[PDB]
Design a protein around this ligand. Structure first.
Ligand SMILES: CC[C@@H]1/C=C(\C)C[C@H](C)C[C@H](OC)[C@H]2O[C@@](O)(C(=O)C(=O)N3CCCC[C@H]3C(=O)O[C@H](/C(C)=C/[C@@H]3CC[C@@H](O)[C@H](OC)C3)[C@H](C)[C@@H](O)CC1=O)[C@H](C)C[C@@H]2OC
Ligand SMILES: CC[C@@H]1/C=C(\C)C[C@H](C)C[C@H](OC)[C@H]2O[C@@](O)(C(=O)C(=O)N3CCCC[C@H]3C(=O)O[C@H](/C(C)=C/[C@@H]3CC[C@@H](O)[C@H](OC)C3)[C@H](C)[C@@H](O)CC1=O)[C@H](C)C[C@@H]2OC
Lengths: 124, 114
């Protein structure tokens, strides 16, 4: 099976994934998979609030199990290995009314540049 | 060596109402490191903290310690890192492998008040 999810939206509130550069179109994360991702997170005014690239530390998590914000748990499984995409996440799929203290204001839409570098032991 | 979660009573609650897993709790807290430095306090913001307890939304030491408090109780919760933030710590706030000392006041259980 092969596919490229060039645009994907789930919800208006919700999450949008826009493919920027294709992955291999074959390997997609499933629930419970461990993913390795490089990301940069920005607010809608363009200001950066975090970046794994800036600290040269790829981020790893189990996907689809509620360990990350909902926009990532829903959006990352729509990426294939090696894909670069942009995730736009409304507050309902992010940090909601409170935001994240010290980093993200309440009621913030989030824009993540994400690169899927790994799915379990598969590497881009 | 040894690790774990210890609760020391400072002022008793009503001794009758205890949070069950899945209950909402309303709590005032101050968190300190073992060197005495304060890293956070709901009291300083004068904003009670609310969470659902026993469902993994907070560190293990709170999920384990708070259900042993009765309504209105003031206690000190000491939490070794394996029941807190572990080797990772919390970025910008809690060093890796930190024991945590929380002053905890159980202000409410669901809609119950003292
Ligand atoms: C206990 C510490 C542990 C930290 C790490 C393992 C290091 C890791 C690199 C986080 C960053 O450390 C510099 C840093 O990254 C952010 O800047 C970010 O860019 C983001 O938003 N990320 C990050 C990338 C994925 C999407 C999104 C996210 O889901 O992060 C999760 C998160 C904060 C989830 C909350 C948990 C409570 C819950 O109520 C809430 O529900 C809405 C969701 C992180 C990975 C936690 O699972 C683990 C940690 O927190 C956010 C703002 C703060 C975060 O720092 C703490
Ligand atoms: C999505 C944002 C959301 C924030 C709030 C709702 C505001 C609330 C007032 C937190 C403070 O905001 C000023 C502030 O409080 C601390 O200072 C603290 O004093 C502590 O330690 N607390 C806090 C008191 C209970 C015990 C302990 C704790 O469990 O907090 C949880 C926590 C951080 C759990 C992580 C989640 C990822 C997971 O991987 C990790 O596993 C080890 C545990 C908080 C309440 C999350 O449920 C929700 C938020 O994070 C910690 C250091 C950081 C925290 O700020 C973000």
């Amino acid at each position: 099976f092969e596919a490229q999810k060039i645009e994907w939206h789930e919800g208006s509130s919700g999450v949008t994934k826009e493919l920027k550069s294709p992955g291999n179109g074959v390997d997609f994360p499933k629930k419970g998979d461990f993913v390795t991702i490089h990301y940069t997170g920005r607010l809608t005014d363009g200001s950066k609030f975090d970046s794994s690239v800036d600290r040269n530390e790829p981020f790893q998590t189990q996907i689809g199990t509620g360990r990350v914000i909902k926009g990532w748990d829903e959006g990352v499984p729509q990426m294939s290995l090696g894909e670069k995409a942009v995730l736009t996440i409304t507050p309902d799929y992010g940090y909601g009314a409170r935001g994240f203290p010290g980093v993200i204001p309440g009621n913030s839409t989030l824009i993540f540049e994400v690169e899927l570098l790994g799915i379990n032991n598969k590497r881009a």
